[PDB]
Amino acid sequence: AEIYNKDGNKLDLYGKVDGLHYFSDNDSKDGDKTYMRLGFKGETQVTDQLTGYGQWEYQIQGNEPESDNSSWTRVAFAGLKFQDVGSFDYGRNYGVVYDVTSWTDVLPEFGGDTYDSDNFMQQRGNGFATYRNTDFFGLVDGLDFAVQYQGKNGSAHGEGMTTNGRDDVFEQNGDGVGGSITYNYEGFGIGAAVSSSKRTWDQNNTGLIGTGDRAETYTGGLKYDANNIYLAAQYTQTYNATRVGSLGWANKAQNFEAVAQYQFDFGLRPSLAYLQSKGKNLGRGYDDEDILKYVDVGATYYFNKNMSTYVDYKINLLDDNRFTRDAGINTDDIVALGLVYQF
Amino acid sequence: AEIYNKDGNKLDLYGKVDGLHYFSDNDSKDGDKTYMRLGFKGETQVTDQLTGYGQWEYQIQGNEPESDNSSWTRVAFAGLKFQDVGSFDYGRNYGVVYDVTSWTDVLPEFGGDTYDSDNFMQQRGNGFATYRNTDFFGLVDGLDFAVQYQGKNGSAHGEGMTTNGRDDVFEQNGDGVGGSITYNYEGFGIGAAVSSSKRTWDQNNTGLIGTGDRAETYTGGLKYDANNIYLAAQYTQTYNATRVGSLGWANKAQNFEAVAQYQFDFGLRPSLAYLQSKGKNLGRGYDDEDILKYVDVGATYYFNKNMSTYVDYKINLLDDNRFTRDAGINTDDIVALGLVYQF
Amino acid sequence: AEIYNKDGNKLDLYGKVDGLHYFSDNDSKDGDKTYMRLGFKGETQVTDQLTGYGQWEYQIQGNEPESDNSSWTRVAFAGLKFQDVGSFDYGRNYGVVYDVTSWTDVLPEFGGDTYDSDNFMQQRGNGFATYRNTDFFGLVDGLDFAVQYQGKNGSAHGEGMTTNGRDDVFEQNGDGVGGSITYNYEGFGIGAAVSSSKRTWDQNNTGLIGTGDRAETYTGGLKYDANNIYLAAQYTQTYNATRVGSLGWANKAQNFEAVAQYQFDFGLRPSLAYLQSKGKNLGRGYDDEDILKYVDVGATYYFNKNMSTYVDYKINLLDDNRFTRDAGINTDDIVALGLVYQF
Ligand SMILES: CCCCCCCC[S@@](=O)CCO
Ligand SMILES: CCCCCCCC[S@@](=O)CCO
Ligand SMILES: CCCCCCCC[S@@](=O)CCO
């Protein structure tokens, strides 16, 4: 909600409370999942064509006792935007791969998990410097592109250390570069993205699988968003980038996400999605294994812009086998039931 | 404070800073206790008779250094309210036992501690699904009732695990059911509450006292709230529900709280309260011991709705003995001195 | 930003996002340093001459992954202000030594580090009770003084324990008393401050250097703040108060900070500063060592009140030697590059 707008600056304070419950045969995926998000979007008019902005978003879990409550920053960045030239922002933000893969990340509860947070330039992560050009200098409405640099987020000790270092190797990265191009026209969307990150010393020298010099993602995507119908698909082919449970990363992975949705006038929105991640030549005796594979059927009912409720059913297609147990990958179904207020 | 109210949605952002200091012979209860609370109450008009709402409240301690600052969510829930039918909400919220025991939880600093947070359905806890009926379908002004379900909040590992699991057994619970009825009329209040929770495997198989299949509370309460006078009393009889320091829980407990207050026109509000918790047949050689017992004398001076200061004197009536030392229960006096800004 | 002002109470919700990056040969000082701050300033008119107030400020780091995000309260206090008499506030707040040393704490990124947080009464710390007199009862415009008491912030276990205890001895303190006087007139500022804190048992009995009965600071300061020119200097002489890396504290220390700045009309603000901390008779074989010593050259460009960017270059003058390695003191340069949105 816009709670301030005065003398050239405005501030949107926004958030939500999701009363959320998971039902699953997997005990680790069963029970209260209530949480909230809080954020602000600030924007200031410097001149006719130049605006400064800042954004911050924070998740606070609501399913924990008061002795040990968990929370974190999703994004936190500042930037500058010049009309018919472009923008620059820096901070914790989304990787440019997500400019395309976000198109399928629209399920009621699940989805968007053929990749993780702090997972190279694929989703949210630290220290992105992002240059964006919107509508090609105002000459081609709908044509957007971005170039993105991610600085090294290293270890918390020893060699390859950064000031914001982290001992979990799955959350580290070296210097990376990425780009995205997208074109939207009368509801039809088409986009490509590419990212290339250096892998740090710790992630290649701790005995995990999917070691190598660089992490790489190549993404293509298509969507249709008009007349109350939402169709989208994305295919990403990764190298040393996709996480495989606890085992490490996938030498090669082929990720595919597809979604179909329809918005009824009275507020009902049914959703059918298919997500899949295929590990190829994973090593460690596993050759070719499904890292992820499930069908998602669900529905959100929008009371209005400020309130909704939804059910989401993750029909898990993975087999319980040696690879999934070793990696610690869930192969059980999850049904999500949620009640959501937002402002 | 209402910082937003527009096109059918309003948002109250509220909070306070309590500059607070404790004086006690017990070193663990002596010193700076400064803290703040922050929250929002959001509410949206869906129709003439249907409203959606969300609430979130957060405590941030202000008495710690910057290397290690502690904070937690008190409540976080969403819900729906239909006029002359009732409400439903879900999330971290207060247990329905508190619909009655809150009546004595009105002291300046102390009080309200014959029970804890995350202590079955007695106070704040995770995953409450709460149905409420207000004024009996609009036919009996003052008559309220509630039915409440709390889902299992289990361990963080092994058997009886939940996704929001917790290794502290005092903060766990199994499935529980509770109800409350209250009637208020021209300042006079009368109420009863009942709760029945299943106890998890860990809380019955870790060597503690007060083990058993279910936790149970039966509460009665009376109050008078009119003509600047506040009188209230509550009596709760619990089984395997009341915490006894570190020892475990009380097989049986008899809890009683009584308060008397008077609001002077110029802003002074003196308070006299008596709290007591009697453990019966506690085992471990005890067998009948006071778990809690103190008289509280205090006063709050309200400068206005936004500012006040208070002194609160917990005259501790417990004897320093084997049970209290073993349980780790404070038997020393505490004087609280506080300065409070709120909005 | 003032987001509420109604019926005698107003509330300023403020904050910023600093997209920040450090470049240094020291790996521990190199990389993403993005962070945000959030706070509110509340103030209520009780009468014509009496106002109640509350303030709270919070830092949330933006350079960490979502599994482990760090945050803390900077200040949290309530108080009362009577016109032409003075104010009283209590809580986590700034020590009165800072009434003078803040004058040099105005660099774009660095500076203000001849002392720490939770470092006796020198900067931010817990449990300050602060009495302030502004303009000497309204009889001498510009003449301010303060008396301040800090209650014991002790250990988290054993002897010398407080309820808000802390096991890091560098963040503990005993009872302390401090005072400040300042005089400002047509841009010219002059001030003195004195503080005297008791050192706790743990800080004198854990093998560190700079042990002794009391911590003491004596501070003098001068400044000029007018006609777009900012000049300021502070000299503090401390005893058992200044931190020396991990080694302990400095028996005696001589701290000096000097700054020169100029505000161009078009928004550029160049800054040149010199900071220095000289340890005297440190013991442990060290004798006389520079604890801190660097020159700071930098510049902030203000787009407007809500947006800016800056570069800050810490030219480190310390030699890499036995003392600096043992203490773990950085002797490498740091260049800071920041983009900042604030409201
Ligand atoms: C789409 C914009 C192309 C990226 C160019 C950025 C070059 C880095 S520059 O902005 C910093 C100068 O050191
Ligand atoms: C008039 C009904 C009394 C309240 C009982 C609530 C039952 C919960 S049920 O509707 C959810 C399980 O499907
Ligand atoms: C002349 C003003 C003196 C300021 C110091 C106040 C003394 C502390 S006292 O008021 C609290 C002990 O009860």
Author numbering:
A (entry chain B), B (entry chain C), C (entry chain A): 1 to 343
From the paper:
Porins, which are beta-barrel proteins that traverse the bacterial outer membrane, facilitate the uptake of small polar nutrients and are the main entry pathway for many antibiotics. At the eyelet, there is a strong transverse electric field due to the presence of conserved basic amino acid residues on the barrel wall facing acidic residues on L3.
The conformation of L3 is virtually identical in both proteins. Examination of the electrostatic surface calculated using CCP4MG shows that OmpC20 has a more negatively charged entrance than either OmpC K12 or the presumed parent OmpC O6. Examining the pathway of the imaginary sphere used by HOLE to measure radius, reveals that the largest differences between OmpC20 (and 26, 28, 33) and OmpC K12 (and OmpCO6) occur in extracellular cavity above the constriction zone where the channel radius is narrowed by over 1 Å in OmpC20 (and 26, 38, 33), due to changes in L3 and L4. During translocation through OmpC20, cefotaxime penetrates with the aminothiazoly group down (the θ coordinate in Fig. 5a assumes values near 180°), interacting with an arginine cluster at the constriction zone.
